[PDB]
């Protein structure tokens, strides 16, 4: 396809938007064998459950109550997404992260245990989002889900559509079977860099392990707060593995992992490394020195300190140039660009969170 | 009566499993020998790595620090500043899968601490090591030592088999409360799943840094499941797990407790307040809070000056030392709370 | 005269809304407000060939075994079966929230009692339990022990911790006190990979391979001492096969001889303990229905007392409930399988 | 140039456990990895410095009579020769080095630092060829490689896999993903390219608990539990269609027992008769892959209460695909003179002791 590069002018970047295919919208893009397989088996993943994930959403699917269209699931109505989000907030680069093949919140195609099905669902999702959403309205651009757990298939999909100007990133999950610095994933990083694509890792369930490093959570506070933990672990692996020494142009964004907690995590990483760096003598930089060039984080759901001045402090302690606005439309903890930041928040930092920082991540 | 300066985390290092033989019944002592005495020395502080011991610590005939009370006491108390030290032995009994052997070796380990440490210097106190693979057996171990007040807390590892708030683990919290003892979580683990939610860290360094994530999980479990309402005198010490990570975790936990309170309706106070009142943290490692102004900053972000308690983490080597925290604050008052006043809440030890 | 008991048939919950009449207002309202996520398991994917045979009666959505009328019509039509033991596999055990697990397990048992046991006196049922909290699982057993139409305790083949662990002893204690066998049925909580080498990539791989977890459970139960501590314990393996038992039994016996002082309370051989305390349903038969193969497997088990007839209704297996007759020449053995062996479990007469 | 192995009057032993003497791997390890081991040891999927999660019971699980004057059983090549090779006329004895030092089971490939793991595998391979195989080529090496990092395993198979002193690639029974996963396919491709079969030996570790339903408590559970991993691996390798992609690949399950595979395979077929529609691309009926692709070694021999059942079950598995092993020097060593029941048929035992292994190893 041919499409101008995204232009962010007076508008803003929204790094996380969740569209969902209407019932049947993927079938034109799937082989008959996979339509039959889905009819007969559904999409088996790391659960013993036919239709839901291991932590189903608490209240109304975790969607804002005003984003339900005439008929479908929130995010399934393109016109509603235009007026409720892109028009309303003057979003000029809205990055699509399709988290499910259907109207069933949070069930990523890449996590199907049949990885041939997973690949087929990712490919169908990519063809669909480009045809149905991006090309009709190129304010939207795609973060293309691929099968991180089967790198050969991911590399093939990145080669197939990764150079399409409608695509701006590769889309993975926060949870994986091996930490993301593992050599398993390096072929995907190689293919991404060859297409000059950054990678976004969105909050997920699944992965193959429990949702903490020390057991499965019980209550919803534990589950939702627990999502940050996976991102902490992924940051440590990606940095300490030397992945960014091997791929010195690779850019990664943690999406919906919060921001502020990264600052003291990185601080502890440096402090520990000062004593124990002999274990990993090839690493070229002090661990925190990788952040500026390699690690981004989106804002939603915004951190809410008790004293608001601590927000800007912690965002700058992470890296003020590497924080990128997202709304998470249409989820219930959606953030509004006009109200997400504290009244006292520095205007220059807010402006670059809304514009410059994401432009630099997405190569605009 | 002035609160004592308590070093809230120092370590005894078992020389070898043979040191347990005097405190094991014949069945277990003969068994240990016949099995060629496999050592459950943990990999949490690899003996050959830079964290294991200060280069100038007193050492035994094999070059190892902290394997005798004589050596530990010589080093820890030399400068006269410390009044008491709380000994945690991390010998890996919790990684013994055989449940009867876990019980027997945990007991023998506590006897070794009592007879070869606590009896040797009255400035030493200790945690009770418990067989956490059987929570009812862990409760029995706490009870067995509840009459020896030199045992001042219960030792749990930061990574457990099931989260500590699960009802399966309530006997531990019940027994600790019944004994009047705080519970400490110390870095280390049972390794019965990957140490993270995304798989196995590939290095000791990656593992060590990243165990803070499991402590967020443990605190959310403990609080969400109702431990602090069901056992309201519970006190929790986080030993050698950092602390700068707490405020961002506290803020998100509070935000989501507002959203989901009806799921955990017994939690009627914000996690923010419950954590400030029931959780204390040791200061070694300080993870950068020793840098100029950063200790004042983290106390401001915690919203409480009552949580940090002094430790040296003897004999371990960290990037900054036990008293380097003084560089992070301009308040002598704050240092007085960290050095002595905050730990009074845990142990009630006076000079 | 011992009754012909079909020792494993299935009730299928229509949807979580069917639980509403049996939930307190807090849980009924929370269910509707959650948009009623269904914990329908993937153990028998509803669209796959195992889920129901083509002769089974179906409801308006094309699903078999969602009503007692349909199940009783099909199961009892030919007059051969006297009683049937209903297991509902709805996935309450995969509810992480522990109070909800308790509430939905209790509601599910109420639904079985009111919409199944009350409707036909030939039906019996297992007690579904909240196995994430063994204390609460014991209380669920105690609560239903008064209703003798509940004839066993339901546990899944894959648990969170092995069933012989002391953490789980309250379940075995409560089952023994209630006079109830404990059944393990294929299915699981999926709180680790279903195998020691990771996640099966298909339902077929998963289904076949769950036998390995039953070897683990039996070794845990026996080695940890359940059968000495709770010596009246009876264990039924439901819909988990059985031809794998003898090679497991022989190796367990061989290693018990090597490791006796590690588990000194196990004074009888695992061979004898398994033959005496373990029973197994016959559907699926996993090839034992072929000529001579039922006599062979009984010879290899060393006991004709273990196999108990089931149909596994409404599931479809390669061979049918009575095709086991093709594997034996012994009417005495068939008498044991069709009626006498299950008398040890349920004491049900015609 | 080393002669090809020749089995005439003697036997194949598919599983022998030598151990390097202290320091014996150092000439074959870069100084950086020497330093790493001095400072960190060999960290794996435990929280333990020196032992695995299930340390051995009595005497290290070694034969009481296999200790040399100094060092661990298996560490003295002259005692290996006199107590094993000469004593049992082993003419193809396949070395499976399970530990880089004086231990029973701590595999190099399972080090969590996979660069270290690769260096230890390489050092083990150079060592066993120089110390054991070339001096006495009745022995041949099954080369450990890093199954969890296929690039490194492929490199090592390319480096040494064509050496005539090597007869197989060596993996572990436990892995992070079932062995039919595409992750391991580059290793299968490289092995086929070197005309090498693969042996997977009993292991701890892998990344998961030792059963699919929790960690075991007592030694009966741990040791009997080893069978479970091999059941799971067989199902994955077959049902994944790995042998459709690699129609010449041979794999042997080592120390997983044998008889249990027969009813497992029987259940696999019976289930597939109904559920085959889930995997329509699989070319054959599942049990049909066994004959051409799946071997199993015998130790510790299955001991049914009625001995006649052994031959029945070995044949129900596949009588041509069962291969003798002693497991020297472990405590449950099988003596080829006594391992088989009195009534066992000579032809089947002969195949197990000779022809079957010769076919698997291409001898
Ligand atoms: Fe999102
Ligand atoms: Fe969201
Ligand atoms: Fe410490
Ligand atoms: Fe069934
Ligand atoms: Fe072996
Ligand atoms: Fe062995
Ligand atoms: Mg591009
Ligand atoms: Mg004594
Ligand atoms: Mg000094
Ligand atoms: Mg507030
Ligand atoms: Mg009749
Ligand atoms: Mg060759
Ligand atoms: Mg294929
Ligand atoms: Mg086909």
Author numbering:
A (entry chain H): 10 to 373
B (entry chain G): 28 to 378
C (entry chain C): 29 to 378
D (entry chain D): 11 to 373
Question: Could you pull the original sentences from the published paper?
Answer:
Here we report that the 2-aminoisobutyric acid hydroxylase from Rhodococcus wratislaviensis, AibH1H2, requires manganese to functionalize a strong, aliphatic C–H bond (BDE = 100 kcal/mol). Structural and spectroscopic studies of this enzyme reveal a redox-active, heterobimetallic manganese–iron active site at the locus of O2 activation and substrate coordination. Metabolism of 2-aminoisobutyric acid (AIB) in Rhodococcus wratislaviensis proceeds via the initial, selective hydroxylation of the pro-(R) methyl group by the monooxygenase AibH1H2 to furnish α-methyl-d-serine (d-MeSer). Previously, recombinant expression of AibH1H2 in Escherichia coli enabled its structural characterization and revealed distinct mono- and dinuclear metal binding sites housed within the AibH1 and AibH2 protein subunits, respectively.
